[PDB]
Symmetry: D2
Subunit: 459 residues, 4 copies
């Protein structure tokens, strides 16, 4: 049921059916804080880092081919989802991520030993420190895994979903390009614009956010691996840092490079503080877009009601006709989450000392959460709401034509004085602009229909 | 003035403007921290003057300071409190993190002025001395935290709480006046079961009442004063009765319940009382944001929003937006509520960042804290007098929305059954009809029955 | 493998081996955002709310005894941990928590039907809406569960751990009450104080935080249940709101009361915004305490080194003698998390509209996380670090006696002028105060040992 | 002055001070928003004046405004830019959320002054008109966002970036000067493998270089101007060339790459460019916090801290703390870095809170943004000149710590083997000895061998 595993402090019992070792077991017993664990993206990035390190150590003649191949095979098993229950450690561990580094070293060593015909435990044929951690330090491995996970998540999840949502809204903007509606400034009725123009604002916001996110990628692509314990690379081959970045770039198909200054790479989380700045920008943009959608869809009768959205879940049986904007609610909630995550990241990033920033598990927990929230939130909002946005054309026209705002089209025909008189009379007596104008005898009905053309008021 | 006076400290001599009352340490801080434009607020300057006035009084009681000097220092401090010396305090927020330089600013101004009041002169021939007299029995480490708490407690008691009570009373009056006005409910921004406008406003009132209690709970900790802990909290180099006596004297002259801090190490090493008190202020900011947003959304119009209430129109609108009334008080209030949220983060970071015997993020913490108090107090005052006292229902619009909604259909359930009531609401929604038109079209009731049965005043409890 | 469950929108396939129904299934398919789910504390609070509602509905003659008992029995199974996999829904759902309310209604109805000899699915004998949700709305149920979970977590986890940590530090303060050490202000050497006095500051901070947290409890104890959809309580028995708060108080042994204003209770998360203000205060205090501990323990040779802390995990094999302050790192990280969580909560709490705040799942996700982090963090820091803090007496004395700070004891014997001269000479020439004083001939060695008594300098 | 002048707007007449140049709309805002003390910063006032100067120039080019009036408006705007009218802009940050009232403040001051420049008078008999002339072709909705971006881009280009470059150069010089000084590393606050002081400082340099790139990436979006979108973004009621022409004119007169925003709806409905640019500023704040903390911890002492570097002593220390040098520049800098973090939250909330065609959180957003720029620019300037240029190593203390540590023991591995080296380090740690004393006590090497083998200059790469 248990086996005895050892580290420099002594022996400790580990579950027989688990692949980790003594240091993982100590962390599991001493850091029992809350429920947040390393996310799968980060575990995979740690496995990729070890896979690349083993390949380079073999190329340099520092690690035998049979050991290096077995380590890479064990790492591929982690990436293939075969070992999710072998990583039991909390986010709230040592601030360098040493314990999760050792978790990977121990699981990979014990599994690689089995792949070479050996066993797990202290009789193993592959060793967590001398083999799996060769040429490495927790201090440079963990920030490498942080940047690998972050860059891949941005490239493979967030950016595709952002592009997909932008395309949907761009199609809606073109489809609704001719639909004139009332403007709203300060929440008050205002000069008209088209529904397509209003949506084009959302599109332009999402296009700008994509650029800002792309600008953050080169710094995240810089990897600490090869700085070792304090940034000097003491005890490493001079080609190791470049070689391992190159190998990570090959196996991930992403443009990883070695960090030109390893002291900055170890002492800070600056690349992620900056990249998260772009994500909180996206959260502010998505909050505004989601709010416009739910306010424009508010109703069915006592709100704005200019657009309809898909109804995907049963409504309340006592609220007839109501369609709750549930995707908008999930999206606005996660946008608040991203804003809070930014503060946590900023505090951790500001708090490095000397050669090492030791707020790393918390920083990456927040960063990767924000990426999941924004990527999955954009996917959900796109599929279940944005693709189905439709205008309520009769309601749009009713609001526009019963407003006071079309009165400006009369200025050039009867003068601003009488046009203002028409608007004040309509407002005071609760009439339409046309009715007030006819009551005053300032024009005929034919003149009003010829002069007041909303389609000529949106240029 | 171009002409200078040479002032001295332990570092040497430095030129100060001849027409100013400060000394060498103020001048060095002025010259070395040319960072942005934020200076100590008047409330903090006054709190420092009160602290020196009380310290001089107690030093006289204890036989440590002559009556002549103590009276002159008191008179100089009273001139500061009367607004006669605002331009004698030129230092930035972004100075030493203990606020020592502003402590020395007060010591130097009071000493130079007290010297003049005794028939002497300002400068190095002065008869009253900034360190030996005005700072007697004190440390920057215990004076600046004391002034922080004096300024904070007085601002909460004299500005914020009275304005909170006034706005609460106004909204309570409105809730009573509008207690019988039934309106449509809104949940998720969608039409919902009715409630009265008075009931909705009663929620705003209850929020402000709860906020008052939370703010009151934070006052006892702010009332604890560091004065007497001296440099590191031990009280070394002060009379054993000084801490209690000076807190008592501050309580007498301010009419506020100041007490000496029971643990001077917590008092010097942290800003915890202000971190906690600001937590209650960000709670108030979240409540005011919601109230202000309800008001501006309910007033939105004139024709393409909600329009259930009207608000006073205080500044001319845009000539090209006929009939629009921008909710400008609501905008100022929502903006300052965002500011309070940001201020809370800055305070939390400073409060989390003490080391060993002293927190040295103090000017920044008090800058943010006193700003939030000014914003919330003056914002509630302005919103009350320029908006809240004049909120009025638009009764015809309220009834139009209610009567054209689908939500009154539940009143039919007991009369014709849920199945036929649901059928009426579905037909009305699908065909764009009122409930009455749909019910009549199906032949399920008469017009008189609809008018007798569908009574919103019976649907609000 | 599947069964067909129905709601007002139609039929949907649900796993045959699961107890939820149609609305849970729709949420599971439409809100696939990230990995955060309702925490167990909130699921239990939802079950307690349904258990209390069923009891009161039975007391009022609105629900049959056999149905009410079966619902309570099913709820007890949830509380006993038998159904954790029956609650699959994301935090990032509808902002009122309707979907999790329906998750509980459906699981309890299907299970209670089995307890009455029936089956799960559409032939069930107990019904999610007409039975399990009787007299209730998602709008008042979810904020009730939020406050039940929050108050119980504060009372049963956070406050006990805060008291335990305070007691440990109080014992350390008394044990070290006579150990004089150098003060530090601005990070510079300063007037002496005892190690016990310095620790007494930490104790007083924790005592103050307890009071602030206690002040927040009465508002959290106010429950929305009985306000129904908009706060008016339309369609409820007039005794229901008081009766259900009373029943929750009985079954939880906590002082729950009905909210005196149901409009405030539905339209805001104000009680939790305020209570979280006290938690971020605690986070700022714990950050400072944890930083003092790790700085005081820094070394082994090139830091401060005035205290030792337990070494619970093996150190780095290339950093001989180093003991990383790993509990301090976990604690400082989670304190940053609480600060970020406060921002997310504040944004959600500021964002109510009209009759309902629909940021609720996000608010409670953050609030309950902060409670777990602070409670478990205090437990971990206490057990694995604080209980083992010990002074390094020789190092403390070396720093104190080699400093310049004891020179003030000479003022009353030789005058401030010569005492200042001694300190400047020692500083300039790198001597001890005693050596500089003897070189100047200002006293004898016997006089220095009689006059310079650190034990007389801490009052 | 007590005497008043009656000024009029569409709401009626209101008294303004006779000695002031503003008009009715300014006076109403002044009277109705008595909230705290924060006003528009001078940078924003100047940006508004530049916007009006460019608008008048283009209106003249297009034949819409007489040469006489356009020249007078330009002259009045140049007086504002020259600092002659700072007391003509009395309005609070906490005003209408569009900044309309400050737009009108500029329109009224420029019109009244331009009238005087044409031989007329201020007041209702003026020859130049605030709305018809000074605001011609414009809206508050497009003017205030334009001034926000003009002020922000110029402050980043002219103040922040030059000070960032200067501090970076200073630290690069220090890193080169100290490239050969080996010191103890510190990870987790524990003694660690050595590196040079130059290498450690090179990390600070690389941080500041990366921050410069991030800030530069944010500039193109801030350079996009809303002017020409008019009330809702459509450009209704403006010449089709106005948007491009005014952006071009602003680019000429400021020597900055302003362009018209390609989507005016995004430009009016959001503050997204400033949300994103402030993200880069909070990154810089986190970097500067770390650098400032390294400096003050490395300078801590004089005898009971680290003490590896010395910093300039600029203000006299406490008389009771002999030898202490408080790192006051580091304290001001760490405080302002906390402020930037809080400012970011306030900006994010305002930026997330637009509705429909207009974001009306603008005064608050720009108040915070321009404050962060002043704080970071002036803070880097002050830290550089009063601290960074004078950082020096304490070479004997650096060597003392290094030689008394356990960390040099790895240099023995190749000479005596890992097992005996580990034994030496364990004995030294357990018994309180230097590595050399422990190695000699065990008889594993001679003193000459230790001195020849343990070479820190070979342990830093």
């Amino acid at each position: 049921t248990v086996r005895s595993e050892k580290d420099s402090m002594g022996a400790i019992d580990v579950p027989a059916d688990k692949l980790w070792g003594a240091q993982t077991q100590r962390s599991l017993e001493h850091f029992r804080i809350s429920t947040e664990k390393m996310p799968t993206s980060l575990i995979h990035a740690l496995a990729l880092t070890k896979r690349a390190a083993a390949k380079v150590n073999e190329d340099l003649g520092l690690l035998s081919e049979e050991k290096a191949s077995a380590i890479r095979q064990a790492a591929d098993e982690v990436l293939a989802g075969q070992h999710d229950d072998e990583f039991p450690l909390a986010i709230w561990q040592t601030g360098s991520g040493t314990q999760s580094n050792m978790n990977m070293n121990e699981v990979l060593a014990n599994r690689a030993s089995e792949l070479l015909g050996g066993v797990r435990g202290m009789e193993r044929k592959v060793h967590p420190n001398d083999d799996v951690n060769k040429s490495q330090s927790s201090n440079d491995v963990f920030p490498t895994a942080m940047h690998v996970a972050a860059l891949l998540a941005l490239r493979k999840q967030l950016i595709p979903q952002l592009k997909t949502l932008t395309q949907t809204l761009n199609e809606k903007s073109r489809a609704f390009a001719d639909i004139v509606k009332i403007g709203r400034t300060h929440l008050q009725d205002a000069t008209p614009l088209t529904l397509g123009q209003e949506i084009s604002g959302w599109v332009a916001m999402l296009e700008h956010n994509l650029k800002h996110i792309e600008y953050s990628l080169p710094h995240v692509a810089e990897l600490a691996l090869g700085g070792t314990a304090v940034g000097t690379g003491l005890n490493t081959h001079p080609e190791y840092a470049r070689r391992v970045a190159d190998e990570l770039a090959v196996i991930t198909c992403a443009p990883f490079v070695t960090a030109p200054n390893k002291f900055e790479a170890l002492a800070t989380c600056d690349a992620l503080v900056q990249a998260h700045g772009a994500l909180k920008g996206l959260a502010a943009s998505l909050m505004k877009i989601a709010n416009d959608v739910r306010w424009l869809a508010s109703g069915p009768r006592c709100g704005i009601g200019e657009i309809s959205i898909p109804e995907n879940e049963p409504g309340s049986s006592i609220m007839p006709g109501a369609v709750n904007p549930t995707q908008c609610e999930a999206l606005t909630m996660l946008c608040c989450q991203v804003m809070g995550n930014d503060v946590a990241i900023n505090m951790g990033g500001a708090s490095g000392n000397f050669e090492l920033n030791v707020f790393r598990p918390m920083v990456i927990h927040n960063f990767l959460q924000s990426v999941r929230l924004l990527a999955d939130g954009m996917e959900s909002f796109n599929k279940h709401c944005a693709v189905g946005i439709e205008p309520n054309r009769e309601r749009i026209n009713q609001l526009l034509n019963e407003s006071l705002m079309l009165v400006t089209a009369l200025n050039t025909h009867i003068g601003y004085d009488k046009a203002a008189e028409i608007a004040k009379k309509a407002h005071k007596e609760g009439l339409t602009l046309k009715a007030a104008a006819l009551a005053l005898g300032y024009l005929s009905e034919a003149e009003f229909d010829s002069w007041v053309r909303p389609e000529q008021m949106v240029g």
